[PDB]
């Protein structure tokens, strides 16, 4: 191989290369323009170390505080049914709608797998909306809360067009913490200094900045509350109520055990009341902390009172539900309420004590927020240009490896030189004619008919000094061109004023009579099988100028018929009335009719297909002929097409001149 | 390959190399003279560390204070319509106009993409101006403030020529901060010293120095504020603690705290305030031009190697004589519908054809008759050129010559000789003419000819008629030489039909077009059909340096 060969192979296979590369780059471009953009926000913090602060910022304590603060455990996703709906919706200029939720409590199916219950909300207008969990349709209103079927829901400020759908999930707290921690990173930027660089990435430009602000302010508030808590009575406070709450918990547990020694609505309202009580307790703690560290008119405090009123209304509705159930149910419900509330409050006080104790050991002074979080308006992912370049290069390398595989798996004939190395005289090279009719009659000025005229001129010199005037055209494989070449060559030899007979000795799948216009009665078979005469089998081609003998009816014993002496008598009689006899035969690697006929044929020629046959195949065919007593004069390449690799290897070898 | 070959290839392709290199260096020169110059200013800050100071300089706090102080969120760009108007305007010596704005408030469209509202201001004179956002035309005056159509604007000291336009944007504060931060850098210069090198690059030599001065002063003031914060807090505590010796002690402590708070020299010092280097740091013209020249050279070289390695044509008669093909001549290009051998008999091509005639006069003895057939491998090789001119040059030596144009498909000999188009070769072959009415006379020649006549529908079947051999046998008794022009052999088969009656046959091979394998195929196809080719004739030769360093001159002029 060399530069010419490889350039030729690339030029020949250019369609495949261009198509594959175009597909790959189209897929890359679609992915780069349909992927969800990812923005990044960052903040700068001053610390008076930083190795323990990096680890303390990313602990479940701080992140859990943020999750509880911002209600990040309610996941809302706009509904685009296909996996590409979001990208095209963004591209078409549709602003993505959003809804605000401050209270969500699903019935907590909590089955084996689906640990994250979800519902679907459909927007009807600016005010009303519809909810479906498992086909159960409900109607709700912005403002007033919904408490139905053990489902608590509160939506404010629906900003979307009617008909939109949203999937609403309450994913578990640890899942929310893990999701936030996965995309949030802390660095020092100096490896020794007091500067902390906080980073958070996500697909919502405003929400990520809000989350990072919450994280930074929670850290700062922790340290300032630490420095304040030196004289604060909160530590001794918790130290006092902790044994009391523990004793009350033990008393409740003992009472439950004594009463013990399962209604669906009962346990549903029970766990709903438990969750409400937890929210009231943690909200009381949050209200105390905010009132100590912030003002009443601050929006956070107002939101805290609003949530308190909402939760108290939910608790009142739950109590009203409790009052309507049988006493035997509400007795156990009160027992379980006391037990669960005691346990939950005990755990909350242990967590509070741990938070204070971990604070008091902090050795860092006052924290100084230098840069509050802002979102970079240019997305950091996806990186469009590198994606498109990777697509282009991947397409190119895949196309190249397929091209080399096709080149290295190629075994067919490429040029008459391959046959002529072995010693096989190639007498012609008939190209593809892109134009049931004879080519040499319909389109006499075709390129293939010019090649066949060249073949006629070669034969007029090869067929002299032959024992008689019979020419047999055979081949190695079926559908190689024996009949094409034989019929057209008879046509082009008949127009030079010579009498030509064309015998179709393919008694198996011959169609010469179809292609010439036929009288199917009394073909070659009926002559061989004794039921016809030598004069009733010969016909006339309409647009030809030569006679023909069709195969007749297909016999069941073709190879045994051609051995009968009637065949040689027919050939001997015809050779005295005609100038040329052309016999078409089946292949030789398929059947043996060609080698039976070839005994009476003065000249024999094989036809070799361009890409299909192989040099070994033609060698085997010539040796199988010469083994049976038939001397093959030469070969005729057929179906040639122009290829660049052949030019940079051999040359053009064909032209048009008109 | 060797030194001679590569030098020859470079000499032959000199036009391509010069053109490509000139184009790339012209593009590089245009870019280096039309790129907007970028000046650089720098300052030196002393720290009494330097790792957190670097990150505190480049924070949104200091840079945001600078943006707010200097109104850097109002972006003004003078309007030149093309991407090269500014560069040529600078080259033509026109100073760039500028205007001062202290308040701008656009209606803040804030659509999906265009987050930066923009207007265009057209200057009419030293005082008045016009404003247009989206076709809404308004008029304003320097001095008096404008509040119209949700647009607040104040422009002062318009310094420009009338007709100029300025694109005015209020890009958002964060965008201004990011823009300033991209062009602002800090370095330590010692990895331990309190020396910091502040650098700022921009396209306005004065404004960048002003901005860097503002940044340095903001940083210094902020640092001294932090240094005095502790003393101010202690003084405030003492003031809140004041309710007799203890009273005097507290008064003395308060006075000392006042001194410390007022002095407050921090551990930061401005050694060098910013000044702008008058030589732009970009574009670097010399490296740009050198890159352009080198890129042009390497592109030209790789293109030359591709053309050399993809070349397949014949280069010299040595290639044909390797295979065993006797080359009888090499006819060069004649740069001069007329016969060359008559219009300009002193041409170089006619001299080469006279050499061919002399070779033939010795090659054509001991031949079975006096018929010469000139054929070829591909169309447009020079078969008719050589046949007609050779007949002309053989006719002037007092010999009778007949030129038969047996190219019944695309022959134009009658056009080139001056014609009576009736009764050509076809009309003779198809029986509708006699042997005597087909022969005509060349005017400036001296030899007879037989034209192709009318194009028949069966050319190759006509030449198989015995009438053709009868014509040749009759003409061989009345003429000293018969030259038959034929179509190619790789295209049609007329040449191999005619060549049965021709005593001598010669192929014509074009210089750069045909290939050695192509000529081998043509000669094998002739010899397969019973026609033995005597030799070849190279045609269309040109002088090339690579041929000199490989083969030689092989031709000269002598007049
Ligand atoms: N050079 C060619 N150009 C166009 N079609 C061809 C050519 N050679 C053969 N064919 C066509 O391809 C088919 C197979 O050829 P055919 O001679 O009939 O098969 P077989 O040799 O087995 O008898 C035929 O339809 C034929 O017309
Ligand atoms: N050495 C040459 N110098 C100048 N012109 C030439 C030369 N050889 C051929 N030509 C011109 O180029 C054209 C092609 O040559 P021509 O012999 O007429 O075609 P063809 O060989 O196919 O019969 C002609 O117009 C010819 O005059
Ligand atoms: Mg067949
Ligand atoms: Mg010609």
Numbering used by the authors:
A (entry chain A): 17 to 64, 85 to 297, 304 to 477, 494 to 716
B (entry chain B): 17 to 64, 85 to 279, 385 to 477, 494 to 716
Task: Copy text from the publication.
Wzc, an integral cytoplasmic membrane tyrosine autokinase protein serves as the master regulator of the biosynthesis and export of many bacterial capsular polysaccharides and exopolysaccharides. Wzc comprises a large periplasmic domain, two transmembrane helices and a C-terminal cytoplasmic kinase domain with a tyrosine-rich tail. Wzc regulates polymerisation functions through cycling the formation and dissociation of an octameric complex, driven by changes in the phosphorylation status of the tyrosine-rich tail.
Here, we report the characterisation of the structures WzcK540M2YE (Y718E, Y717E), WzcK540M3YE (Y718E, Y717E and Y715E) and WzcK540M3YE_N711Y (an additional N711Y mutation) corresponding to different phosphorylation states. The structural and MD data reported here confirm this hypothesis, showing that the tyrosine most stably positioned at the active site is the one immediately N-terminal to the phosphotyrosine (or the engineered Tyr-to-Glu mutation). The presence of the negatively charged E675 in the tyrosine pocket we suggest is incompatible with binding a negatively charged phosphorylated tyrosine (or glutamic acid side chain). During the progressive phosphorylation sequence, the kinase domain is a rigid body. The movement of helix α1 is directly transmitted to transmembrane helix α2 and then to the periplasmic domain and, in this way, the phosphorylation signal from the cytoplasm is coupled to the periplasm.
